[PDB]
Amino acid sequence: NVRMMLRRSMYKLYSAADAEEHDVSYDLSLVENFKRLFGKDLAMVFNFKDVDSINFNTLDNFIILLKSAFKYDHVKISLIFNINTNLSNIEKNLRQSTIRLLKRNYHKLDVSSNKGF
Amino acid sequence: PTTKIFTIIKKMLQETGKNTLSYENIVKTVRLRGFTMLQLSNCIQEYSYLNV
Amino acid sequence: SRFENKLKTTQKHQIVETIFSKVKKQLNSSYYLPARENEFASIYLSAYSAIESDSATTIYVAGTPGVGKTLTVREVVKELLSSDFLYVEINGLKMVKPTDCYETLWNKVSGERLTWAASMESLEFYFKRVPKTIVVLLDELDAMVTKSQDIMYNFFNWTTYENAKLIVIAVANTMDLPERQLGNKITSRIGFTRIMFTGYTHEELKNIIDLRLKGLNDSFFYVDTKTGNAILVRKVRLRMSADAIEIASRKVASVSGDARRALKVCKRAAEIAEKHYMAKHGYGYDGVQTVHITHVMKALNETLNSHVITFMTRLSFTAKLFIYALLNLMKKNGSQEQELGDIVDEIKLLIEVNGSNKFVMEIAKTLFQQGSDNISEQLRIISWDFVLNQLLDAGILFKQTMKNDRICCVKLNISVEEAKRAMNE
Amino acid sequence: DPGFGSLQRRLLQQLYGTLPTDEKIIFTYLQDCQQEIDRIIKQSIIQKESHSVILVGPRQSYKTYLLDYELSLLQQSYKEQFITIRLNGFIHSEQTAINGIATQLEQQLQKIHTISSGSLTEVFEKILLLLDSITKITVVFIFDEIDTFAGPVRQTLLYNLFDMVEHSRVPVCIFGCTTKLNILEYLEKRVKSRFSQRVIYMPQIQNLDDMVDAVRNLLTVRSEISPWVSQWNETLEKELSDPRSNLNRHIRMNFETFRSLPTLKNSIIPLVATSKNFGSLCTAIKSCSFLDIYNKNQLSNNLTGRLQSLSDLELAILISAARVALRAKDGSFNFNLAYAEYEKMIKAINSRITIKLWLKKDVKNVWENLVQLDFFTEKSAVGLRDNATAAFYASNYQFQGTMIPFDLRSYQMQIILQELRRIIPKSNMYYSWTQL
Amino acid sequence: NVTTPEVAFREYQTNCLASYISADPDITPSNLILQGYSGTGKTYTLKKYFNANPNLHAVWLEPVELVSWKPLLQAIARTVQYKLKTLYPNIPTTDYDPLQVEEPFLLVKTLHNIFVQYESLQEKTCLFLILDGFDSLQDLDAALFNKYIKLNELLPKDSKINIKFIYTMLETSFLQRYSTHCIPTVMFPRYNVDEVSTILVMSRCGELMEDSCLRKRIIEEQITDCTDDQFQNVAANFIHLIVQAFHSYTGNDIFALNDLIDFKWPKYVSRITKENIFEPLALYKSAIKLFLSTDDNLSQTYDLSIISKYLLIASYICSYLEPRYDASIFSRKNPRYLQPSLFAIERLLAIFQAIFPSLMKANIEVFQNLSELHTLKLIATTMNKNIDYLSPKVRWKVNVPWEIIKEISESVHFNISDYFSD
Ligand SMILES: Nc1ncnc2c1ncn2[C@@H]1O[C@H](COP(=O)(O)OP(=O)(O)OP(O)(O)=S)[C@@H](O)[C@H]1O
Ligand SMILES: Nc1ncnc2c1ncn2[C@@H]1O[C@H](COP(=O)(O)OP(=O)(O)OP(O)(O)=S)[C@@H](O)[C@H]1O
Ligand SMILES: Nc1ncnc2c1ncn2[C@@H]1O[C@H](COP(=O)(O)OP(=O)(O)OP(O)(O)=S)[C@@H](O)[C@H]1O
């Protein structure tokens, strides 16, 4: 859903945040107060493992939720789209209003075990 | 025109309290008033829905 | 217990005890019984044997609500305090979760509070180990049967132990309850006593009224003419016409045979004469009186008569415009359930099939724009979401949920003939 | 002048009814209904009656406005004499409402001069023993949407309070407010026998003259505050006495469609605050042209102004979208069926004459706004669930329509083809395509 | 009485929001609806009011950065005691736990606990709560919106501080469910083609004359001392043309114009000359190539192998080929538009063995590429994605459109258009 994709992901960074830090709520409340909750700033990265099996409207509604975090200026977001193939399939599935959100600084790096042998 | 006529029946029900099916002495107090024999004939059948 | 000391306050500024106030004090539903006289013994002689012999039995009574089965078994145990037991009112509907009754029993043996799991362990440990006395009322048994019958098997398996100091008394809604909800393995444990309670009869319904009207029927009050206060300047009396009390009985015994319904229709009819007496003289709130037959004629009808007919003729125009379109489709198709877009299709069509009558034109001007020839050309009519929402929460209409606002079906909820009939006005 | 602005202070709080409780004004078409409510409520506290009632009437019908009016009418003279407990059926479920009662009980005790502590059924038998049991405190219950408590499954909370009528020495009174009309059949047998059966229906504006009489009592100020007042009062009725006056004309429209006063009461609030001097306000109620602009704005984007505010292509896609929709029996149509017939429509325009026919990869960006402008719907899509746990059962359900691609989600129609001809003007070139 | 601001195209709507909002609570109506679609600046025109009114106090909440109502109650109760700390710092406080609340009773339980210590204030002060985006909450239903309407009346009405609401939502089908509550609504209309361009020019002059991509191109070309007005003209000539060559593609949006500008702007900058600064019409004629293409799409020859390629080409056959016809026309002796039908297993290998160049019999690698194609989501299960292996009742289906099939047919030299016959 939109819900547990948020909630598990906030949980997964939070234990990663306490382990480097040496009660709270698992949503975007931590994201703004991360400057005060943990001192230093935040640069998270999103290893979307198998991206074409997900219902894309959930993914499209997910990225609009991340769009609201762009007004705090102490956090940096980075998305990694590990597709299997077929980039043209992916620009078909999403909402076109979010592709224009995506198309700011895209980089189509190829990673293939078989690349020119 | 029918709210009063239940109470003259209640004046009989004051007297003996009888729920008889066919009438010869209930109708006797009706003809001196001004209503016909047909209006009370409907009043027999419709007050059967009141189970009285 | 504790806070009833705090529920008392001091300043009580001389409330006017009028004529009909002292009626409603005894017409309160609180304070030997005439109707279920011998069946009180049939419970009690079934109960007196097991009590004075240290056994474990079961007693099953049924009947419609309003017949005294809440009352009678309280009168059983009440005299028994004069002559070894712990009384508990284990109500079914007063338990939030069905397992919560288990907590009460283990609370009401020593005073401990554990879970429903840990209670019934020690309850079972009680019911087969104690050397040798517990009365328990399992009221309103429709509540505690619902989930998987695992609770109900326990409450009768405890009865089977010969070393179980317990006396259970079940009071249900129907005699059918261990035959259409329970299993046969419970139905062996329920026994075959099965004391049936019928309704009340209309003769006894007279005999229950005057028990409340014992010291007050045709008695005398002492009244000052200035405030309307009555004391058990004139010395007035108040009489109750017994024939009107009789016609109260011959209806309530006919339909329901309910002891609350008989008292309350007398209680409702009592206050009709209260306001009419206050209307004629105005004593506020700071020769021979009676209660007519015409009071209980209204108040009994006041249980029956509706207003949805009067509600419909007092609705808006577009409300009555809506239903008249809706019956037109139901006699066009005969399918009693029409698509929402077809109704919007019809109310368009029901404009121009009528002529160029200027009333319809003054309607048709207003029906698509609130005057204001600037803004016009509305597709669906003005406030069409509003009246359809107003007909929905009123309960007259019913509309299934769909995000399409065209093919969502609509179903009537009241009888369509009375909808046809109220439309005629 | 501030005296004109002081008149704005008086007139506004008169339109909200936020006056002190001596001068709150009840309209004439319901004065009888509050008095029988008053005869119920004041003999419940003073004369210690223990009887219940159900208020029934449609939404926005002063029902919650009537009851606290009585309380404020009794708060002035009977201060400590009673406490009120108010429960909404909306805000309270079946089980937290027990905690709703007990917590609202104890805060009254400090106002009148260990309860909420324990389990939910532990505090439940507590308030059972505290209620069932110089003078006694009486308790007034205020229930909003009591029909939702009257569900099918348990109905516990109704069964306890109605038995508190029968046995408790503490004098209570219950006030059910709802809008489901036949409330009595919604109850089962064993609860209705506890019920004292007395319901009271709420009145409606039965004649055109009634709300005309209401709005006169609504707008007229009787207390002397401003020098403008005597001038202001006769301007009001002079508009109201004339049946050909525009304010009297537009009130007739409100009697027709809505027949509900707070709808019209809503309209006047900007109309009397938009004026800046005294004379402009009198012209405003003389002209009532602002009501036209107001009813314009309330209408401006439900369905028609949605259609007027689209470009040339967005019309042309949707116009093609209905001409496909007329062909099939259910009316459903895919995206490929749309763009195919959209192609030959543009080809017909050039061959009968210079119009940029767009590609495939771009119509999707226009197709995105059209579905979220609700001009189309998905074929089998229940839009909004009624309550929370029915919506939560729809969230876990993985769907099949997303698993077929974007261009094959079988979109159906919200606005039918024949109705497009009536709204689209003939000056537009696609007017020949509205009709088939 | 209030100090209204002034904006571009909300001249009616600034008046009503100045009408329906006062610092006095009695004149202030309880609940309010600001309605309009995205692309009207309602979050713009609301805050633009609030900056012009420092007398009132606003607490700004954001539902779209939340996910559910259970944190949304925790969102409210954390903020009011956060705000009232910063409004009356002399008032002592038993600070409560905002984590504690999770149920709609608990809010009014805690607001009964919050406001009572603030009773000693001097005048009835209001306090405006603002919810932004109430329709796009991702767990909404029917019985949530009314649940927040009656929250005011469960509060004690005689407290010195009164909480009132303003609701921002969209999708006006949703508002038609609640018109019978008759709460005062201020609808926000959509825009017209001029006022889109009129809004856009006064909002994008502040960046597109100050971008370094201009400022590089200033000093890179022979810079004549062109004025900021000369920079203003070419910026205005850019905006007045970009909305003209794209309005049919975008509708009356503002967000979808705010980014297409920021894609085509530096590509417009490179095609200017020193001389075309005075020559705007010929400048468009030299920079023409971007104004007729979208440039939002950042057709693959697919990666999969040869036997998997014929595995795809047999799966597309049962979008039209029914079992009544296929075994006759494929002997060893139109729904191109329509949605695809449902497979079963071994009907693939029925068609696969026929159309392959006795030359093949081993089917281990053929079974390999099936669940390879299942991970590519090009052929998916009808049911849930779990038990599809063991042959219970499982139906299969393609999810690839016709064109990618058509290229992949010729990519393996196989002819497919013969066997599709209406
Ligand atoms: N024979 C009677 N004599 C005197 N009072 C009676 C008699 N029968 C009923 N009542 C009164 O009427 C009330 C009706 O309650 P009951 O009939 O005892 O309850 P009920 O029959 O179990 O209906 P329930 O509890 O909903 S199943 C009693 O509480 C008494 O106050
Ligand atoms: N605090 C208040 N003071 C005075 N009038 C109020 C107040 N709150 C609401 N109203 C009025 O209440 C009327 C709406 O009717 P209500 O009874 O509040 O709603 P209802 O639909 O009749 O019943 P509810 O509220 O839906 S359960 C409007 O005329 C409001 O002006
Ligand atoms: N009158 C105006 N003057 C200047 N800029 C305006 C005006 N109206 C709208 N805008 C701009 O329009 C932009 C749109 O902002 P938003 O409020 O997000 O639009 P929206 O319709 O509210 O969509 P949302 O955010 O989903 S509610 C604002 O950021 C402003 O820059």
Side-chain angles (χ1 to χ4, degrees), chain C residues 29 33 65-71 140 200 208 212 259-260, chain D residues 194:
Chain C
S29 79
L33 70 156
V67 299
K69 53 202 179 315
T70 309
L71 176 59
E140 284 280 2
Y200 274 7
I208 195 176
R212 313 295 177 85
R260 287 152 191 128
Chain D
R194 304 316 222 284

Side-chain angles (χ1 to χ4, degrees), chain D residues 420-432:
Chain D
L420 314 173
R421 184 157 192 83
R422 209 157 67 253
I423 171 63
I424 292 170
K426 74 193 62 53
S427 64
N428 177 271
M429 47 188 164
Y430 318 134
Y431 188 77
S432 41

Side-chain angles (χ1 to χ4, degrees), chain D residues 36-47:
Chain D
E36 50 210 12
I37 277 170
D38 167 70
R39 281 206 76 138
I40 277 175
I41 191 52
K42 78 187 293 187
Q43 87 190 19
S44 61
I45 164 173
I46 308 162
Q47 312 190 331

